[PDB]
Design a protein around this ligand. Sequence first.
Ligand SMILES: [Mg+2]
Ligand SMILES: [Mg+2]
Ligand SMILES: [Mg+2]
Ligand SMILES: [Mg+2]
Ligand SMILES: [Mg+2]
Ligand SMILES: [Mg+2]
Ligand SMILES: [Mg+2]
Ligand SMILES: [Mg+2]
Ligand SMILES: [Mg+2]
Ligand SMILES: [Mg+2]
Ligand SMILES: [Mg+2]
Ligand SMILES: [Mg+2]
Ligand SMILES: [Mg+2]
Ligand SMILES: [Mg+2]
Ligand SMILES: [Mg+2]
Ligand SMILES: [Mg+2]
Ligand SMILES: [Mg+2]
Ligand SMILES: [Mg+2]
Ligand SMILES: [Mg+2]
Ligand SMILES: [Mg+2]
Ligand SMILES: [Mg+2]
Ligand SMILES: [Mg+2]
Ligand SMILES: [Mg+2]
Ligand SMILES: [Mg+2]
Ligand SMILES: [Mg+2]
Ligand SMILES: [Mg+2]
Ligand SMILES: [Mg+2]
Ligand SMILES: [Mg+2]
Ligand SMILES: [Mg+2]
Ligand SMILES: [Mg+2]
Ligand SMILES: [Mg+2]
Ligand SMILES: [Mg+2]
Ligand SMILES: [Mg+2]
Ligand SMILES: [Mg+2]
Ligand SMILES: [Mg+2]
Ligand SMILES: [Mg+2]
Ligand SMILES: [Mg+2]
Ligand SMILES: [Mg+2]
Ligand SMILES: [Mg+2]
Ligand SMILES: [Mg+2]
Ligand SMILES: [Mg+2]
Ligand SMILES: [Mg+2]
Ligand SMILES: [Mg+2]
Ligand SMILES: [Mg+2]
Ligand SMILES: [Mg+2]
Ligand SMILES: [Mg+2]
Ligand SMILES: [Mg+2]
Ligand SMILES: [Mg+2]
Ligand SMILES: [Mg+2]
Ligand SMILES: [Mg+2]
Ligand SMILES: [Mg+2]
Ligand SMILES: [Mg+2]
Ligand SMILES: [Mg+2]
Ligand SMILES: [Mg+2]
Ligand SMILES: [Zn+2]
Lengths: 150, 208, 138, 234
Amino acid sequence: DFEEKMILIRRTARMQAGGRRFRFGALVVVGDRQGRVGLGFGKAPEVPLAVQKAGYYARRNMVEVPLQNGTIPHEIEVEFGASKIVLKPAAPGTGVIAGAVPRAILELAGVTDILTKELGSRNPINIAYATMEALRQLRTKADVERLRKG
Amino acid sequence: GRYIGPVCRLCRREGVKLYLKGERCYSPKCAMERRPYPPGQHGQKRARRPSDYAVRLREKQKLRRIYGISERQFRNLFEEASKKKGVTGSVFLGLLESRLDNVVYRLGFAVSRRQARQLVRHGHITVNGRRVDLPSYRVRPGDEIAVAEKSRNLELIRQNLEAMKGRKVGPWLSLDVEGMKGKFLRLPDREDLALPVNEQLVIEFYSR
Amino acid sequence: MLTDPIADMLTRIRNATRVYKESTDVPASRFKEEILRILAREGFIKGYERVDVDGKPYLRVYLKYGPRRQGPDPRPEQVIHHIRRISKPGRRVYVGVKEIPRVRRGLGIAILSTSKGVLTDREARKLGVGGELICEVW
Amino acid sequence: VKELLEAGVHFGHERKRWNPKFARYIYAERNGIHIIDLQKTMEELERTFRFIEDLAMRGGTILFVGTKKQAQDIVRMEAERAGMPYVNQRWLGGMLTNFKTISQRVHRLEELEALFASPEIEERPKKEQVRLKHELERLQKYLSGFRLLKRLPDAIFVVDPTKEAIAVREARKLFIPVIALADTDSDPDLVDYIIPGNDDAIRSIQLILSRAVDLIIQARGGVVEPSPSYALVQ
RNA sequence: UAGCGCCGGCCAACUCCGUGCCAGCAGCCGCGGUAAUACGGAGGGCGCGAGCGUUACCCGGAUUCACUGGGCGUAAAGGGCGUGUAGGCGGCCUGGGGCGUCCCAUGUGAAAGACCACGGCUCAACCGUGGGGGAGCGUGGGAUACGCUCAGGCUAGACG
RNA sequence: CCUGGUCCACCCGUGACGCUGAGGCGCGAAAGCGUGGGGAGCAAACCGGAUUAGAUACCCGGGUAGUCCACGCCCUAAACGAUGCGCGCUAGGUCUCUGGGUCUCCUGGGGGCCGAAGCUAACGCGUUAAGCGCGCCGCCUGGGGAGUACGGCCGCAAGGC
Ligand SMILES: [Mg+2]
Ligand SMILES: [Mg+2]
Ligand SMILES: [Mg+2]
Ligand SMILES: [Mg+2]
Ligand SMILES: [Mg+2]
Ligand SMILES: [Mg+2]
Ligand SMILES: [Mg+2]
Ligand SMILES: [Mg+2]
Ligand SMILES: [Mg+2]
Ligand SMILES: [Mg+2]
Ligand SMILES: [Mg+2]
Ligand SMILES: [Mg+2]
Ligand SMILES: [Mg+2]
Ligand SMILES: [Mg+2]
Ligand SMILES: [Mg+2]
Ligand SMILES: [Mg+2]
Ligand SMILES: [Mg+2]
Ligand SMILES: [Mg+2]
Ligand SMILES: [Mg+2]
Ligand SMILES: [Mg+2]
Ligand SMILES: [Mg+2]
Ligand SMILES: [Mg+2]
Ligand SMILES: [Mg+2]
Ligand SMILES: [Mg+2]
Ligand SMILES: [Mg+2]
Ligand SMILES: [Mg+2]
Ligand SMILES: [Mg+2]
Ligand SMILES: [Mg+2]
Ligand SMILES: [Mg+2]
Ligand SMILES: [Mg+2]
Ligand SMILES: [Mg+2]
Ligand SMILES: [Mg+2]
Ligand SMILES: [Mg+2]
Ligand SMILES: [Mg+2]
Ligand SMILES: [Mg+2]
Ligand SMILES: [Mg+2]
Ligand SMILES: [Mg+2]
Ligand SMILES: [Mg+2]
Ligand SMILES: [Mg+2]
Ligand SMILES: [Mg+2]
Ligand SMILES: [Mg+2]
Ligand SMILES: [Mg+2]
Ligand SMILES: [Mg+2]
Ligand SMILES: [Mg+2]
Ligand SMILES: [Mg+2]
Ligand SMILES: [Mg+2]
Ligand SMILES: [Mg+2]
Ligand SMILES: [Mg+2]
Ligand SMILES: [Mg+2]
Ligand SMILES: [Mg+2]
Ligand SMILES: [Mg+2]
Ligand SMILES: [Mg+2]
Ligand SMILES: [Mg+2]
Ligand SMILES: [Mg+2]
Ligand SMILES: [Zn+2]
């Protein structure tokens, strides 16, 4: 099991001749607060259907973030097209100082103290995809000296 | 200032029995064991989904209204704690538990922090010889929070320390019921503390 | 005219490590050679030699990629992830030992030409000098 | 005894239609044809075959994918002889990532083989007989060999990665180590174990795959003589 | 002595009644047309509390003047194009200078504030002492990679 | 006839002479204007014929200025590859224009298409970059007001900046 926190739920509408059919989108993250997050983005015509589908994709697609002291190894300024997010690691005992979108991604990675800024466009989908790209780009001292020791 | 009065209402509304009344909140009529749902005409309805601001505000209220601190006194304590060099929450909690009314509560001269507030405000408690009439009086590590002579034979302090004959004060504290004093040894931490407060959400409340 | 030769050479390094070239043939100078000597000291690259085409001395840097990763897009992650000429010609930056940057918490480094030779930022903060902060490599 | 035969027809293919990341192995260019070097070919054959001899007797299953006219029945013959599943006909969309769904099609194949040997010829009338026969043949055609071992694979043998870009992307998505025979019209980046060499000469397919299947039969124990393409050829 | 704001979202806290595109609300989105959680009242709640609100002004959010830190095909943005003055920028090896740069001890960087300890007012606000930065800028010495310039050379730029 | 640009080859000479460039100066379609000339077609305006409710329009007949020449001004444009210039790097395939070669190729310059990585809001661009860079220049900072007004400068004026 994981903590299963949803970020945004949105109800997107395609046009049929007649009404306009909806499709509830739902961006959950799953996290054990150990260093594993998953970003699932389910699109279902019903809402608990959307939360179940998104949790299914999120548990299916995980990423191990290599934490240290409950925070992050290095400063990382990643981008997802127009949405760019910086993460500056903190001295511990500072709090997850982040937006409402990546605060849950970091807090379900189980960081404690991280200093971010949702730059660029702050769209809750793109920022979460950028944050998964950040925590998949995150490297520590051991697994960079392993790539330099040759 | 003291906010006032109704406090098992705040034993409710955050879902944890943060003890404010005292022996009432220990006795089987807390009206938090009886009714765990928050006060209000709605109250026992579906939980409105607690927002990201809502969870930080509720748990910052769990940190505040335990100690009864007025918010700007709390916030100035926080903006002293952030400048104070240390793990920020785990120096903030020690600063909160180093107030004189809270040290008198932890020392058990009173069943509640508001009774301890009346004790220190009405001039009963002495710190290092002379009486100190301040609930916000910080206690430096290594000083003797005592009871003066006009309140040593008080029935309230007598019954309170009667209750505290054999009770367990903290490892950052001491106790002496034969002289009704106690050395505040060091500052406590969250590992020392029985707080129903994730301190980190209170830390995250103030970078709003 | 390779208006910055160092910012030409580091982007030759970057444009070849992106396409996973085995080796670059950058042009030759003593400053570029000491910069690549710093990079091979730190362990980003597999050195350099002295090649020639039609009377043009070079440096052939041999790059150092990683293991073939699993999952889709299995290209090896590159030890020269980011590389950036900081003190450009249009803006020459210089710092002292008080303003030496820890380049992303000491994973990457900062090549800086100091007065006591070209140094890494560890060597700059160890010898005391600052200088022209040439390029952050991380 | 290997390259003595691999130099037969089994090397030298597509002219001027080449994925240039394959240029490690590409040797020369004569008559337009990009002839492929045989030394690095045979050492890469050993790099594949070491992994096949490991993960073939470790309970691991190989999934033989081949869709072209050149490599259909010489995949179908040599694929069934080690228990290994195959796709002779058009390999569908997501047999691997959607495997838990195409398991329902395998079970409809099983519960239609129940209806073959059934008393539902007498009842279950002729207009449902033609419907379930058109279901059974159109399911047993494109899902024939993908039935043998009822789990996700442990490696796949793609016989052409550019025709099977649908397949190599799926197995790289599912961490299945692709081994694939590829001529100059493919890239080896998303191929975990490459057989460099031709793909459309019938000997080029069948002889490489027959040596591979002799290695997997010997990895199971008890080696028997391989399958013939030297029966109706030429 | 306890009040003031707020309860549609942003923003924590929701029901009833009266109103019926009216009366009104508003910071934006917008509510109001007869079931209004958006208006008026009551209940209840939330926030703060001898204060709470509003206004104006400023900074932040505003990476929305982008040095750190933006762009220019179509979104706002390539000058109609060339030649070219000022400018800005400048290939490679060598040598001095030490002008930029960097370093070192000082000289100043007043006090007050800011910061850190430690103290006095019952604590705190304040206030006292001590200590440390403190950009700069002068002075003296050193460093010479890079930027500089003078001298020497080269041929990968450019021209013939 | 006069003359510019550019490319190849040889690697012959110079020895960094380079690149960009605010203001300048020059060129700058088409329309327009001036002074003459020329006027066959076409053709704004204009006149008619239908058309249509109306038709100042499409359609048709006519028809001037203009289109044309020379000199001289104007100086805007969807002056567009809506992509400033130069240089360096980063898979390729294509036919295609030119250049060389003891030439079923291979190298140089130019004009497109399909595409690697990368980019991008996407469309798509993709060694002729909208990739990676560096230098320099111009420009943008919500739309409308408004490219208007005022002033200045230029122009014969329209009008431009
Ligand atoms: Mg679907
Ligand atoms: Mg971006
Ligand atoms: Mg924005
Ligand atoms: Mg916005
Ligand atoms: Mg009471
Ligand atoms: Mg802050
Ligand atoms: Mg700069
Ligand atoms: Mg709420
Ligand atoms: Mg009315
Ligand atoms: Mg109101
Ligand atoms: Mg009514
Ligand atoms: Mg009503
Ligand atoms: Mg109301
Ligand atoms: Mg502002
Ligand atoms: Mg700003
Ligand atoms: Mg800038
Ligand atoms: Mg536009
Ligand atoms: Mg535009
Ligand atoms: Mg323009
Ligand atoms: Mg203009
Ligand atoms: Mg242009
Ligand atoms: Mg020029
Ligand atoms: Mg000049
Ligand atoms: Mg100097
Ligand atoms: Mg001094
Ligand atoms: Mg001072
Ligand atoms: Mg005192
Ligand atoms: Mg003081
Ligand atoms: Mg002082
Ligand atoms: Mg300075
Ligand atoms: Mg000519
Ligand atoms: Mg020569
Ligand atoms: Mg010279
Ligand atoms: Mg004209
Ligand atoms: Mg005129
Ligand atoms: Mg005229
Ligand atoms: Mg006519
Ligand atoms: Mg007419
Ligand atoms: Mg008419
Ligand atoms: Mg006409
Ligand atoms: Mg006229
Ligand atoms: Mg013109
Ligand atoms: Mg005009
Ligand atoms: Mg054009
Ligand atoms: Mg044009
Ligand atoms: Mg320009
Ligand atoms: Mg070309
Ligand atoms: Mg994309
Ligand atoms: Mg293209
Ligand atoms: Mg190329
Ligand atoms: Mg405006
Ligand atoms: Mg005017
Ligand atoms: Mg005039
Ligand atoms: Mg102009
Ligand atoms: Zn209670």
